[PDB]
């Protein structure tokens, strides 16, 4: 098989997957949803114990075996081969949820090309009766139904949720978003068609640009008057609501989606080169840079929110309460509309979001494309381009049902149900298979001399008890706590809750059904069946 070549492209790819628009969206959103300051204190130890061991162990396993992501299990535990299809379905769902955000971001980038951005005021295609958020000389009387120009732009222009009365009501089509998704899919298909060479070559040009745009946006937002209330609200200890009913589980899920363990991308990036004496270093640096960029995004978001609250002369905890994922697209839009240096900051921020989401979804799709090819050699021989075209077709077919519907309700449902308990159970079964079933002693007896140092006394005790204990605790809390959802003054009905629970349960039923298929295809009694089926080849 081919190799990554030079370590620089591999490091760039890992850090590019680390910097994720999904994380930049979810971290400050749930932060402000739970209360802001009471989100970072019970977060650091969970982030460490969820990212460091899983990422490091999976990178080491990939660099040691080099058999893709699905075929890498044939030499460890062939009973749990269904995890390949599980993570494939998970990646399909995550891509279907990411495509709508990508289309929204690119449509915003297109609409932000005119000299007069359509955010300072409401034009002939917006409800001016409720469009009254204009900073005047104390002549505004906010009521229980007042809205914002950016809110109207996100609601009745790009989404048109006014035509849909919920999930049970069908919504109108959107040709603009349709062509946007078409263009995004052709771009990503032309990007993946070449191969791992252009994969590693395309990350370097899109590596420092998001960082520099983030830095200039931060130094621009930190200068506006009102950058103190935001940071004071973001840096509150708040030791009152963190014991049991806090945001610990949501923070765990957020850092899980950020680090991306078990998503197949790590095994994909490690199945190319051995990367001697640098696996632990790369894992540590990518984890700390992901934590740093997430912290910086949350910091700048809360700074802009505090600035807006001080400009509006209102408390920070009441602006955009019921707003879901719109928070970014509304607050940053209002900030750029208020900034006298517009028409440039919005463009560079939209370009940042576009390239970030592109590299994220590209790595996510490659992590499945290079695994299914290793699983099917008759396809990997010649039909690679045909299969990637077919997977692009099926991905856009799956994303059509959530794009053409014209409603963010299914988007929020997938955001709160697809990247949660299913991938949590996937990570749990992967960890228990690599720790309990597969001997940790013989697992480390090679990676020790492979990386030069001894991983003992930390992972020998972390991979066995505390990590699976925390995983099972998070999973049980998720299964026991009913995930109530609200978005744009719309309560999710019990039928939608049941549908979400059913899709979350069936998203990982492939692993137990494959276990059943294996135990019914293996002859003999149960004892000899298991003891001759779970054999590392």
């Amino acid at each position, epitope marked *: 098989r081919e190799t990554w070549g030079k370590k620089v492209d591999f490091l760039l790819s890992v850090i590019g997957y680390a910097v994720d628009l999904g994380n930049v969206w979810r971290f400050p959103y749930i932060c402000y949803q739970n209360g802001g300051g009471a989100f970072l204190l019970p977060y650091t130890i969970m982030a460490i114990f969820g990212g460091i061991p899983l990422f490091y162990m999976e990178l080491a396993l990939g660099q040691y075996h080099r058999n893709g992501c699905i075929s890498i299990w044939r030499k460890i535990c062939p009973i749990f081969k269904g995890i390949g299809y599980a993570i494939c379905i998970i990646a399909f769902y995550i891509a279907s949820y990411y495509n709508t955000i990508m289309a929204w971001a690119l449509y915003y980038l297109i609409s932000s090309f005119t000299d007069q951005l359509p955010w300072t005021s409401c034009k002939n295609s917006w409800n001016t009766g409720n469009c009254t958020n*204009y900073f005047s000389e104390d002549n505004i009387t906010w009521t229980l139904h007042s809205t914002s120009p950016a809110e109207e732009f996100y609601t009745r222009h790009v989404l*048109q949720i006014h035509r849909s009365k919920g999930l049970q009501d069908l919504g109108g089509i959107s040709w603009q978003l349709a062509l946007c998704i078409m263009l995004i899919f052709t771009v990503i298909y032309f990007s993946i068609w070449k191969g791992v060479k252009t994969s590693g070559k395309v990350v370097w040009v899109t590596a420092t640009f998001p960082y520099i745009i983030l830095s200039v946006l931060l130094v621009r937002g930190a200068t506006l008057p009102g950058a103190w209330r935001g940071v004071l609200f973001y840096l509150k200890p708040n030791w009152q609501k963190l014991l049991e009913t806090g945001v610990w589980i949501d923070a765990a899920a957020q850092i899980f989606f950020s680090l991306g363990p078990g998503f197949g991308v790590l095994l994909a990036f490690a199945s190319y080169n051995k990367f001697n004496n640098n696996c632990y270093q790369d894992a540590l640096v990518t984890s700390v840079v992901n934590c740093m960029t997430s912290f910086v995004s949350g910091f700048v978001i809360f700074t802009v929110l505090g600035y807006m609250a001080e400009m509006r002369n209102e408390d920070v905890s009441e602006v955009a309460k019921d707003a879901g994922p719109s928070l970014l697209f509304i607050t940053y839009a209002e900030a750029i509309a208020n900034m006298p240096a517009s028409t440039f900051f919005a463009i560079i921020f939209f370009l940042m979001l576009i390239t970030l989401g592109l590299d994220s979804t590209f790595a996510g799709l490659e992590g499945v494309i290079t695994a299914v090819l290793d699983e099917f050699p008759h396809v990997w021989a010649k039909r690679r381009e045909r299969f990637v075209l077919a997977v692009v077709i099926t991905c856009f077919f799956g994303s059509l049902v959530t794009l053409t519907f014209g409603g963010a309700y299914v988007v929020k449902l997938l955001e709160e149900y697809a990247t949660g308990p299913a991938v949590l159970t996937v990570a749990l079964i992967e960890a228990v298979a690599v720790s309990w079933f597969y001997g940790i002693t013989q697992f480390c007896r090679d990676v020790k001399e492979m990386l030069g140092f001894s991983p003992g006394w930390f992972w020998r005790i972390c991979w066995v008890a505390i990590s699976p204990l925390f995983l099972l605790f998070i999973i049980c809390s998720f299964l026991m706590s009913p995930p109530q959802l609200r978005l744009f003054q719309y309560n999710y009905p019990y039928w939608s809750i049941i549908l979400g629970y059913c899709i979350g349960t069936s998203s990982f039923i492939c692993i137990p059904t494959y276990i059943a298929y294996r135990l019914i295809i293996t002859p003999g009694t149960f004892k000899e069946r298991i003891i001759k089926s779970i054999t590392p080849e």
Partner: antibody
Amino acid sequence: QVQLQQSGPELVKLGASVRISCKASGYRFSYSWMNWVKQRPGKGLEWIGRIYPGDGDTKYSGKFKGKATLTADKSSSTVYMQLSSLTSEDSAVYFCARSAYGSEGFAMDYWGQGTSVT
Amino acid sequence: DIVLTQSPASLAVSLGQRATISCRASESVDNYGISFLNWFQQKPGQPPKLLIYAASNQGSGVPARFSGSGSGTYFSLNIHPMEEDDTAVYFCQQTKGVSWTFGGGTKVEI
């Protein structure tokens, strides 16, 4: 409410200029558009242009951008229409209508008494 | 530009019968599920009066006899049998961007 009071009649001369005022009150005039129509005696209606108070945005059309100009005044809550090269063709009555909101379809619900510019 | 054409030009409908007014164009003014169309009532000497809101809802203070429907390109203005006082020239307005244009006009009588 209905308080779109306009000015009285004026005299039209060849190569002149007349200003028509439109006093708006009773609602948020700085958030709704201000439309101006042109009706000839014994003819239909002709749209001149629109103006958005508080922002200065104007959209002139209907071969009238060369001789018609709209001006808003947030202090006096009045709308002014600048004219030029007055002729017997454009010498007719002019109204001052206020458009509706977005969900209402931007309809001219409120009108004025009329300004007979003859 | 977007020009409107009305038909018919004159409707001498007697008292006790309904009538219909059409306003055709190249639009297709449908945008965000809101039919961009406005119907006005112009009386001789009196200023115009709004009748239908976005060609779907009735105006403010207007009688229940006024109604209107239609979508896409063709639009119908179905009016209940009126009296000798509701006779007035009606106009259709296209409020879609970026320019606004009025209709031709109808001459309803007995």
